[PDB]
Structures are given as C-alpha cells and as structure tokens.
RNA sequence: GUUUGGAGAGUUUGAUCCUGGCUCAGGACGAACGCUGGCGGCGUGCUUAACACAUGCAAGUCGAACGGAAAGGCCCUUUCGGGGGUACUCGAGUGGCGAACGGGUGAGUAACACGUGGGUGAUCUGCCCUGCACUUUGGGAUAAGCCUGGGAAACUGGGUCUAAUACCGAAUACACCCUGCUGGUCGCAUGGCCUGGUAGGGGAAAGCUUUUGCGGUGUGGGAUGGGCCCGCGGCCUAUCAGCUUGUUGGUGGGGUGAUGGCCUACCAAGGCGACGACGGGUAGCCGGCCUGAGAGGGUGACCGGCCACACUGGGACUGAGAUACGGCCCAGACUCCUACGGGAGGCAGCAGUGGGGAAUAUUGCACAAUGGGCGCAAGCCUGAUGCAGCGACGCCGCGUGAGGGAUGACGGCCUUCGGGUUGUAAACCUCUUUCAGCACAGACGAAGCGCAAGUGACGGUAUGUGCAGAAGAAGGACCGGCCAACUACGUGCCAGCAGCCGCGGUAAUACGUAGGGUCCGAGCGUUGUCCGGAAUUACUGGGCGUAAAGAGCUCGUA
C-alpha cells in the first residue's frame, strides 16, 4: 500500500520539513487538529518514535518494509544509523528524486512505478529497486518528450545534486559512482534515535 | 486379490512351497537317517550314509532351498558326529 | 544398482538440477551418495558442470547413468572417454560473460563527456 | 584472544526503603474468531476420530522365454455365410523380472527406537561393474486348448491334450563347500592370513535372436544396500524399594547369513538396584524450528534422514530382500451378498463422502520435465512427480494517483461569538496510465525424446507492443498511566468498560456516540499457545539473625 492522504499534516505533527518547499507548514508549524497547540508532555519514546516517523514518511516506506531495512542495516557490519540512511538512499525512487527529474519524492515514485526508468538497459518499475555501484539509469524513449519530463530537463536548479549521483546527458541519465556515506547524505533527522526505538 | 499380478503369484507361490517343503523334507529324512545311524553305533552304514547326505545337502543349496553357508553347517556337524563317533 | 540421477532443486518453473551418485531405489529428492556436478536447463547454453575426476570413477565401479545424465557426460566427454571412443574434449558450450559493470561505467562517463 | 551484544512500567503505605508475587509493552504460529478486502510472486492447508467409508484411479511389463490365435493387419477364398493360412500383430494362459521401491500415517515404542562415534578375527547382498572357467547329456509332466461334472454365487472336480529360458536325473567344475593331516607367517584370546601344501567326499547352466543383437552357470574382486554388537547423549514420578529362576554364568547339542539363553538338556548360584533397579505417567527420534545478549527455555507443522504400523490380534509362506498398505492363512468386530449350504470387503495412496471439531481444499490436467518398474529396442506403466483449482492461512512486492492550487469555500465539530479546527484538504487547472480493463504478438523450461521427421501438462498462460481515462481499488484498532494520540454531548454506582491499578453516585480526556487525533494498512484487532521481560530455579546469574528459608543436637555409611 501506499500513504495518500494529506502531506502536510504529516510535516507539521513532526515540526520539521519533509517535503522542504511547503507553506503550509511555515504557517502553521504546530500540530494538526484541534488539540494541536496543547502542551505534549514530554516523553523519550515520543522522540524516538518522531524521528522515525521522519523517516519513513520522508522516503514513503511502510513499517513492515523499514523494519526489514533496520534488520539488514544492523546485520550489517558498520554503524546501525548510517547503514540504515544509506539503504533508504539507495531506494530508486529516492536516487530519481535525489537527480532532479522530479519534484517530490511522490512525484518520483510515480515516475517509477509508472514504468519510465531503465536501470543497466532493463526496465524496472520497481520503487524499493536498490540501486548499487555503478548502476546506469537511462529515460525510455517514449517519456524523453513528455511533458513533465521536458518540465524536468529545463526546471534543473530547485535542489542541489549529491557527489555520488551525476548527471552526466540532457537524456537526463543519471551514474551512481558509489553508495553515500554519512556525510554525503543529507537529511533533517536524528539516526540513533531510530537505532534506539528498535533495541526497545 | 486385488490386482492380477498378486493374483497369478498366489498360484506360483504355492508352486514353490510345494517343491520347497518336499526337498526340505527329503534332507530332513536323511540327517534323521544318519543321526540313528551313529546312535547305533556302525561305523559303516554311518559313513556311507554320511557321503549321501552331505552331497544332498550340497544340492538342496544349488536349488535354492536353503542357504550356502545352512548347508555347511549342517554338513560340519555331521562330519563331526562321525569322526567323534 | 548404483546410479548417476538429477536431482531437483529450485523452486517452481525454476528446475535446477544436481548430479548425483545414488541407490536405484532412493528417493529422487534423497540422501545421496556424492554429488559429482549440476545442471542448469534453464539458462542458454543451459548450464552444465561435471566433476570428470568422480564421474571416471563412478562410471568405472559401475555406477549407471540416467537417460539425461547420459546426455550430459557425452557433452563434456566423460562417456567418450570412459569408452574409449573419441570426443573425449566434448562440445560444452559456455554463456557468453557478460559486459563487466565497470566497463560500462567508464563507456557512458566517456560517451557524455 | 574480543565488543556487533542485555531498556523497563504499574500495583502493599499517610509517606518511605526493602522483600515479594501479580500484570503489561516484544517476538512467534500448520491457527481459529470479529470487522474489512484490489492485484500479483513464492510458500502452505484434519493439530480433532490409528473414527466409518459410496465411486473412480494409485503396479505393471516382456511375442527377442513358450504353446498358441479371441481382436486388429496382410494373403487366399467364396455362396458371403463364413472358412483356412501367415505370424507383422496380440485377448486369455504358462514362464521371467518388478510388485519389499515409490506414497500414507504417528497408533505403539522410554527401546541400541533415534543422534553421534566405533566394532564385525561374528555376517548377508537380486539387478550393476570388472577378471577366470564353462555353458555336456538325457527325461517325465502340466496350465492354455477340447469334452464333461458339481455350485445360487464365489469358485471348483474329472477326462483328453500341448510347449518352454517352467520342472527333474546324470557328467564335467577342482576357483568353491565339508572333513583329516601338516608348513610358514600376522596378531586381538576365540583366531585371521598365505585362493599355503596335501589326502578323501561333494556342489551348476538355457536358450532366443538376425538385430545398436540380447541372454544362462560357477567362481575371484569391486560397487551398492543392509544385518548384528558396543561407548556416549536427549522426559516426569519413591505418596514406585527391592526385582529376576532361561534368570545370571558354564559345557554338550540345536538354530541363523552371522555372534549370542536365540533355543534346549544338564551343571554352578548367580545377575540388576538409591550413579534409582522394578513399577506408574507421558511421548515416535533427529537435521532443524521459535524465543533469547548469551547460557538456557520451549518445540519437532512443511522440507530432508531414520524408526514404527497398515480394520484388531496371531502366524508363516514366496523371495537377494517382507511391519508384505492396494498378497496369503486363522481368530474377532463391523459392512455387504445368498438359493441359508456358503460367499465377499479393509482410503494411516490421490481425489472425494459422512462424522467429530473453533478449524484445514478439487470425486482437476499431463506423463512435456526429473526419479522408478519391465522391455534388445520402439514403447508401455507411474494420483512418485511436474503443474493447475480453491482458502489474505503465511511471507514478500506493487497499486488505490502526481504536480499546482487560498490568508483559505461548503458542510461537520469545538468556542472566551474574536474565531479555531478539519485543511492544500476539497473544488477547480494541468500531468502519468503502474496494477486491473480492450486489442495484437507470444516464450524459456527440450545440446531433451523419436530419429521419424513428429513431440510442452502448465498455456495463447508469463512476458512484450498498442488503445481509453483518475478512470475500477481502504479499512481496522486505539486515544487515564504503562503507551503514540482530547475535547463536546448522552445517561449518574445505571447502562456499561477493564490486561493491571482502577473508571460509572445528574458538571466522566476510562461508559456510549460525534468531531478531532494517533498507530498500523489489504489488512487491523481478539482468543489460544510458547519464549522474553522474570537475576521469579539464579551454570553464566539469587538467597536463609528479624522479610520465605539452618535439621533440636551429635555420631557416622555412601
Ligand atoms: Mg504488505
Ligand atoms: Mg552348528
Ligand atoms: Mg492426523
Ligand atoms: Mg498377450
Ligand atoms: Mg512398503
Ligand atoms: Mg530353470
Ligand atoms: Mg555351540
Ligand atoms: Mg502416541
Ligand atoms: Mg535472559
Ligand atoms: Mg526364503
Ligand atoms: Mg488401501
Ligand atoms: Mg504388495
Ligand atoms: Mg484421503
Ligand atoms: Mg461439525
Ligand atoms: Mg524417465
Ligand atoms: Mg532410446
Ligand atoms: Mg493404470
Ligand atoms: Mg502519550
Ligand atoms: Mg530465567
Ligand atoms: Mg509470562
Ligand atoms: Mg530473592
Ligand atoms: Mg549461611
Ligand atoms: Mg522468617
Ligand atoms: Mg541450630
């Protein structure tokens, strides 16, 4: 399944930007609903909890799926947090949007999923599709001149592209040189609060 | 009773018992026969009977009817009985 | 009899197929004595690998192949050679390796630069 | 050596600290139940009655063993009613091999059943592989056929007649089996080996085919599959203390493939037990699985290996091999047939029915692939198996749209009557059709099989290429503290809630509804069950002055 309803909300019960461009969220940065700007006691699982609700509705991955990424992430041999980030950076929804074809990373999904990439000359509609080193991913002929995508290729600018993607055509092709580290990736959230709410 | 190979081996498994019983009825005869004869006590009429024995047991393991190593055994002890008596 | 059998594995329309020393009477998917190689039908050439050490030696005790297994050996000449007849190189094909990733990482950084 | 790995909260009091139980948050399932429900991939599905079983299938095959000629075929022949021949072919029958595998179930079993490691100088092994020798010679039958009898049926008798790779006698074998004598050698005591040497006695066979030609007998070695013995290991119960007389040991016989009270006659009086004998209860065991920081605890569904059983109890026969599921004999229970004399059955194979239960599927499609049986082979057989159908039963993936959109509509719900929430949400304006839908292409699995040249059950499925349009696609639980998420109204110790502490007594964040919110999402909750938290049986890792706990005190056996 997927999350489908109202964005903002979900930004302003957290208090930070998930989508970045939002202006419902700078106007009304408390919580929703009526209770919204009642006192919360105060509470560490509450934290815990937020941060990864940050995450999971940044990169839309349902609890099912990201609790299996926390699993890999531990199981791996570095640190839980930046295993963590990393996997979810890897996600070719989140690679497509982190390149600029698309504007949210909604949009990207769409794109995805719709069938408008090809990774290594294979189609793949799959929005979880890991992508690892040196991974090519192309624009099928058919949506090269649609009209979102031509939006894409002359709207480049709205965000900074990261050093370990490159986009390299105005075919909008995109290279993966490596996988982020830490320090590559950008993103408005606390790990090891994650690490810490999966050793409860 | 069910399927017809059963069927027809229910005949041919009488067919071998028959024959089996018999040739092992006829050794048993013998070894009986030997037995009396060294519980008698004459050395001659034993050891005569002895050698007819013994190749009869030899032939009832070519048939099949008993085993190689049955019918050195039985032949052993025969032989034994003879030379002790 | 001791004979030379596949022995599936995979899962479904996926048929991968072990090669296998084992009892007439075992089981397809039993214990087995040794496995002495693999074969793959699904792949182009369909995969194929024979431990030729083993197999000389099971077909030399007597080990009997299977109709397929037969095939097989005949491809990679471990029959011919058993025999004595020729073909012992065999005709094994090989897929063709594929383009290394890296490789191609450098062709598109030159063909766009 | 070594980091990859341990979270707590509530509840005894006016308050406190400790001790200590209870309860909760996590994970798991062959699940069930309630609400809800779009698609696909890959798994999985009688846990109860080893209860009873309608119906169809689950083991056959060989004319290159044999006499034969019912069906086909071909050749005569015709009058067209039939009648011959052939043997390409093949019903029934004789004969060989298979039917002991494969599939099911877990009743029994606390045991060398199983796991792991050994032993066999104590043993067997069809078919397969590879050395050696051979495959000589005679004979008497019988099924089938034909005539006829008995019986309701199941079945069965007599006569006449025919064949073999069916059966039977002899020769040869001197590798082999038995006995006596005798030499060397190796050990682990019986003994083993040198096919040691030697004397005496003895042990087999089968033909067919004319083609990739298949077979037969003995014997040496191998390979495979076993048998038997032993060390060690894995349940509760002394409110179960003695048990045993083929029982413990010996010798002479018997028995087996083999060792052995395995059996038997005699002789000795032993053997096993608080390192729990003998009893009672429960249970198939294991690789593994679940949980856990680990140690440990629990468990043995699927998949894989052993074992056990096949309506209940007993027995043997055939065979290389037998718990002989779709064999046989007897006894019993039950069902059925009968002419009342007598007969016939066995789903713990696959599918299916009744029943029991909270609960578990189709009286599919193929032998195309892999494994198995027979056949020289073409081939035949295979409910093994490969697949399909059904059930969110489980796991995983994807969709139910995306961008923009205001000081922010209507409507709903709060209010300090200012408004504030729902909410960028919606409306509207453009943008993409994944998955479903409608067309047109269309597999891999087959270096296979037959070499006759055709051959894929799944399947015109999966997957590609076009078309139309946001178009068809969201629910469930929770919101006092643990524990994320609060207000109004309705009943006022009522109706009800609840895992624990506890909430309802006409102002309830705990009851019911609504608005809003939170956690999850084609699922969400509940019940049951196991581990965790529980250092709460503490080996890792706890205690005994007063909290539960030092025997009333000594002596002394293991
Ligand atoms: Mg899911
Ligand atoms: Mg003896
Ligand atoms: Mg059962
Ligand atoms: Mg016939
Ligand atoms: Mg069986
Ligand atoms: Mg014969
Ligand atoms: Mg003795
Ligand atoms: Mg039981
Ligand atoms: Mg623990
Ligand atoms: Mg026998
Ligand atoms: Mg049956
Ligand atoms: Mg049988
Ligand atoms: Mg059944
Ligand atoms: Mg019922
Ligand atoms: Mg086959
Ligand atoms: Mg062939
Ligand atoms: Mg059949
Ligand atoms: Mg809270
Ligand atoms: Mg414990
Ligand atoms: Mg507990
Ligand atoms: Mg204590
Ligand atoms: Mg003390
Ligand atoms: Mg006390
Ligand atoms: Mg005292």
Do not use: C
């Amino acid at each position: 399944a997927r999350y489908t309803g109202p964005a903002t909300r979900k930004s302003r019960r957290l208090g930070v930007d998930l989508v970045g461009g939002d202006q419902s969220f700078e106007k009304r940065p408390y919580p929703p609903g009526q209770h919204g700007r009642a006192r919360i006691k105060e509470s560490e699982y509450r934290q815990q909890l937020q941060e990864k609700q940050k995450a999971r509705f940044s990169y839309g991955v349902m609890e099912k799926q990201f609790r299996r990424y926390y699993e890999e992430a531990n199981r791996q041999p570095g640190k839980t947090g930046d295993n963590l980030l990393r996997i979810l950076e890897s996600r070719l929804d989140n690679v497509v949007y982190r390149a600029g074809l698309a504007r949210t990373r909604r949009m990207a999904r769409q794109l995805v999923s719709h069938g408008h990439f090809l990774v290594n000359g294979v189609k793949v509609d799959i929005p979880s599709y890991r992508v690892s080193q040196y991974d090519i991913i192309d624009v099928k002929e058919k949506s090269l001149n649609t009209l979102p995508f031509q939006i894409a290729r002359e709207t480049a600018g709205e965000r900074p592209i990261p050093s370990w993607l490159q986009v390299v055509g105005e075919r909008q092709r995109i290279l993966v040189h490596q996988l982020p580290e830490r320090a590559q990736i950008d993103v408005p959230l606390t790990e090891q609060l994650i690490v810490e709410l999966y050793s409860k | 009773a069910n399927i017809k190979s059963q069927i027809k081996r229910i005949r041919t498994n009488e067919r071998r018992r028959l024959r089996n019983q018999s040739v092992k009825s006829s050794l048993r005869t013998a070894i009986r026969g030997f037995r009396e004869a060294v519980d008698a006590g004459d050395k001659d009429k034993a050891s005569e009977l002895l050698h007819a024995t013994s190749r009869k047991l030899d032939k009832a393991a070519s048939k099949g009817v008993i085993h190689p190593n049955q019918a050195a055994n039985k032949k052993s002890a025969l032989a034994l009985a003879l030379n002790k008596l | 009899a001791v004979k030379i059998k596949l022995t599936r594995l995979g899962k479904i329309r996926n048929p991968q197929y072990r090669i296998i020393v084992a009892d007439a009477r075992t089981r397809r998917d039993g214990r087995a004595i040794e496995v002495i190689g693999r074969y793959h039908p699904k792949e182009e050439p369909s995969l194929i690998q024979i431990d030729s050490e083993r197999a000389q030696y099971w077909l030399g005790v007597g080990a009997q192949p299977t109709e397929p297994v037969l095939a097989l050996l005949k491809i990679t000449g471990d029959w011919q050679k058993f025999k004595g007849l020729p073909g012992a190189e065999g005709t094994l094909k090989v897929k063709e390796p594929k383009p290394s990733k890296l490789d191609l990482f450098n062709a598109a950084l030159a063909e766009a630069e």
